[PDB]
Amino acid sequence: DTVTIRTRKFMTNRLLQRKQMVIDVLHPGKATVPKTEIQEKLAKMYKTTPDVIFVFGFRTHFGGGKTTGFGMIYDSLDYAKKNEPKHRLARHGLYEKKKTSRKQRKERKNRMKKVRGTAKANVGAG
Amino acid sequence: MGKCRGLRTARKLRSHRRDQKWHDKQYKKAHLGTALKANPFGGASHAKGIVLEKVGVEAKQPNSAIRKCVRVQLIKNGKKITAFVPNDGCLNFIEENDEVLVAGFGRKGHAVGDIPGVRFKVVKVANVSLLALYKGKKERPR
Amino acid sequence: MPVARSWVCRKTYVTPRRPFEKSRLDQELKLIGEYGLRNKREVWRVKFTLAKIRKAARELLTLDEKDPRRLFEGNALLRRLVRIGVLDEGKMKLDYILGLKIEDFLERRLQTQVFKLGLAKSIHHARVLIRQRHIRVRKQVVNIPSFIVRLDSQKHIDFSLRSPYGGGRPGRVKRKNAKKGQGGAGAG
Amino acid sequence: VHGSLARVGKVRGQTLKVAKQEKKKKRTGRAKRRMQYNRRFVNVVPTFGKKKGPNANS
RNA sequence: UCAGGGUUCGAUUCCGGAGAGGGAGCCUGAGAAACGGCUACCACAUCCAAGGAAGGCAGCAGGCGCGCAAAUUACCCACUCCCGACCCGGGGAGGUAGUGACGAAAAAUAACAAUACAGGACUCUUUCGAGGCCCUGUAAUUGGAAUGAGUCCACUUUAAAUCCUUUAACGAGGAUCCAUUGGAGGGCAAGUCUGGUCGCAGCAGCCGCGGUAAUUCCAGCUCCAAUAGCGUAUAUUAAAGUU
């Protein structure tokens, strides 16, 4: 297919166990390219697995055909799980967000302040 | 004719101008505040009031007509006003003991045209505009 | 409250002081009709950018010859007029800025160039080709008729590559007329 | 005179009423300035020096 | 706002000051005469078993009153920064979306052919008449091509979403996918048209229109000006060499 990828202003980053670059994608006559197709093509460039590759921030220019985004490749998955922000791990199943509302957390705190000693009845089911 | 010109005269020049500004009719009423106490609107562009009475005022010669007007009491001061009602037949919309919005007549507190002693005009009746009533776009809710 | 926003903006034209001057009305309409404009505000924009250019050159002409500021800002103003093709390379001094006219700037619009370069049959057809995504400047599809063409950008105006003229797919009218025409035989 | 003097709304109430005779749409934007230019400058018929305005009735 | 010299404004995102209903007193601490600390008087006001107890939105949303006059009791610590014993917890500071013709930048609402009539060049001809090439309209009405406003799948966007940009499928003949606000005596662009009223109704910043043949009222038609905007009230700068 015509879909083609290039990499710009690259750097190795030994302080965060990664290498990082700007990514340019050419795709004339098509919609924006999925990030799953971008990361398997980068894996074929750098001769790694696609499992340690993270890409984000893609935006498409007026009149189409070209887009630009940002990406990073980690030395191993245990460095990636320490150094990445938790929302980018959750984009593909490596982290799970807690399911309480902010108001539930606020009002449970303000009920605990009205009791002293072994307060748990206002916490486990209150 | 004789104005002083010496290089140290700035106190004489500055204070004589300050003293002579008080002879300009527009400067004085803006800065004494007597006109701001006297004005039946307290410096606003518009006011609300309640319709007391409907009246016809005789126009000044050399022309002949009966000009349709209303007498109104303002909500925020309780003081009394008379106001003109624009366009043909608009007096039929107004009724009695209800709210009007009133505005200036276009000459900053002076009277306009052949109407003796009228300084204001009606612009809104019971929260509907006279233009929207006159052009048939809206009606009085009852 | 404090906020990360900014509030800088300005107006790009001024209204005339005499509303109904007969000598002014027909002069403005002759510029609208010759250059294919939409309204009077679109002429009053071009008079305002010329007035600001002449206001700066009239200041620099007060300073002594070879003053450091007259040398620096004068060379910058002259380069910037040549870059858009409004001023001749063979002239190149502040004294000739005071001789410029509005019709020098109206000629550098992309709408004027699409007509004069022969991509269109009239100044009214040119605006419709630009505003309907048919035209390209270097690599980029452009969509704004008042775009001002630089003197090295001049030789790179063309049709779009994804356009029914310029080598792309046919439009939605020609596709429907062909489809229902074959359907005239039945089962379409 | 019929009824009293100082009766409001008299002449707007007397006046005989007529419906709109128009049908066709007018031009807008660029197309109206194009039409005005062609009518005022391009093809024009000359007169005696007592020149005539755009709405002359007689 | 402004030739040069000036006039007017500055409650309001940066910096300094003051104050948490009105006055006064004080604890703790490096730092307070603190009010999301305390004690009392003065003004309001909630609960009560009448013995008693509790209070301060000029924080963010929301309500009443006032008045010509001002938005949602939404989502989150992802960004920017701060606090603590801390690489980990917290933040209505701050960020995001909703309402929003205060105000600023860009920019649609028709383009092009064929045909009939029309203007004017130019040639043949004494004149008449014909050939003619480049531009206008507009009607009985002709013709093919282009496109986003809308609808709606997918990617991208982001903490999660919306919006914008990208891209498949539907989407235009005009009688609709119908542009408005003020005017047509003068100042000041534009009717010595046609019907109604009769010093009445009304118009008119100012000078002035109307009393039976209205260029000015009320309406139809036609035309003018600015245009996604246009009119009116009131403060203020220029014009004002009328400080």
Curated annotation (Swiss-Prot), chain B:
Record carries keyword Ribosomal protein: yes
Residues bearing PTM N6-succinyllysine: K54
A family per Pfam: Ribosom_S12_S23
PROSITE patterns per record: RIBOSOMAL_S12 (PS00055)
Biased composition (Basic residues): 1-20
Localization annotation: Cytoplasm, Cytosol; Cytoplasm; Rough endoplasmic reticulum; Nucleus, Nucleolus
GO-annotated biological processes: translation
Processing after translation: Hydroxylation at Pro-62 affects translation termination efficiency.
Keywords per UniProt: Acetylation, Cytoplasm, Endoplasmic reticulum, Hydroxylation, Isopeptide bond, Nucleus, Ribonucleoprotein, Ribosomal protein, Ubl conjugation
Molecular function in Gene Ontology: structural constituent of ribosome
CDD domains (alphabetical): Ribosomal_S23
UniProt region (Disordered), positions on chain: 1-26
Positions carrying N6-acetyllysine: K135
Post-translational modification 3-hydroxyproline, affected residues: P62
Covalent link (Glycyl lysine isopeptide (Lys-Gly) (interchain with G-Cter in SUMO2)) residue numbers: K37
Superkingdom of the source species: Eukaryota
GO CC terms in record: cytosolic ribosome; nucleolus; rough endoplasmic reticulum; small ribosomal subunit
Assembly mode: Component of the 40S small ribosomal subunit. Part of the small subunit (SSU) processome, composed of more than 70 proteins and the RNA chaperone small nucleolar RNA (snoRNA) U3.
Assigned protein family: Belongs to the universal ribosomal protein uS12 family.
Function, in words: Component of the ribosome, a large ribonucleoprotein complex responsible for the synthesis of proteins in the cell. The small ribosomal subunit (SSU) binds messenger RNAs (mRNAs) and translates the encoded message by selecting cognate aminoacyl-transfer RNA (tRNA) molecules. The large subunit (LSU) contains the ribosomal catalytic site termed the peptidyl transferase center (PTC), which catalyzes the formation of peptide bonds, thereby polymerizing the amino acids delivered by tRNAs into a polypeptide chain.
Annotated protein name in UniProt: Small ribosomal subunit protein uS12
Source organism of this protein record: Oryctolagus cuniculus (Rabbit)
High-level lineage: Eukaryota, Metazoa, Chordata, Craniata, Vertebrata
Swiss-Prot record, chain C:
Any one GO MF annotation of this record: structural constituent of ribosome
PROSITE patterns named among the record's database cross-references: RIBOSOMAL_S4, S4
Top-level taxon of origin: Eukaryota
Coiled-coil ranges (or none): none
Modified residues (Phosphoserine): S153, S163
Pfam families linked: Ribosomal_S4 (PF00163), S4 (PF01479)
GO biological process: ribosomal small subunit biogenesis; translation
The S4 RNA-binding domain, residue ranges: 108-182
Position of the Glycyl lysine isopeptide (Lys-Gly) (interchain with G-Cter in SUMO2) cross-link: K93, K139
Modified residues annotated as N6-acetyllysine in this record: K66, K116, K155
A single Gene Ontology CC term: cytosolic small ribosomal subunit
Region: Disordered, residue numbers: 162-188
Location of the protein in the cell: Cytoplasm; Nucleus, Nucleolus
Subunit structure: Component of the small ribosomal subunit. Identified in a IGF2BP1-dependent mRNP granule complex containing untranslated mRNAs. Part of the small subunit (SSU) processome, composed of more than 70 proteins and the RNA chaperone small nucleolar RNA (snoRNA) U3.
Family: Belongs to the universal ribosomal protein uS4 family.
Reported function: Component of the small ribosomal subunit. The ribosome is a large ribonucleoprotein complex responsible for the synthesis of proteins in the cell. Part of the small subunit (SSU) processome, first precursor of the small eukaryotic ribosomal subunit. During the assembly of the SSU processome in the nucleolus, many ribosome biogenesis factors, an RNA chaperone and ribosomal proteins associate with the nascent pre-rRNA and work in concert to generate RNA folding, modifications, rearrangements and cleavage as well as targeted degradation of pre-ribosomal RNA by the RNA exosome.
The protein's name in its UniProt record: Small ribosomal subunit protein uS4
Origin species: Oryctolagus cuniculus
Organism taxonomic ancestry: Eukaryota, Metazoa, Chordata, Craniata, Vertebrata
Gene it is expressed from: RPS9
Curated annotation (Swiss-Prot), chain D:
Compartment list: Cytoplasm; Nucleus
Residues that span the membrane, as ranges: none
Coiled-coil annotated spans: none
Chain positions found as N6-succinyllysine: K50
Highest taxon listed in the record's lineage: Eukaryota
Function: Component of the 40S subunit of the ribosome. Contributes to the assembly and function of 40S ribosomal subunits.
Oligomer and partners: Component of the 40S subunit of the ribosome.
Protein name, per record: Small ribosomal subunit protein eS30
Species of origin: Oryctolagus cuniculus (Rabbit)
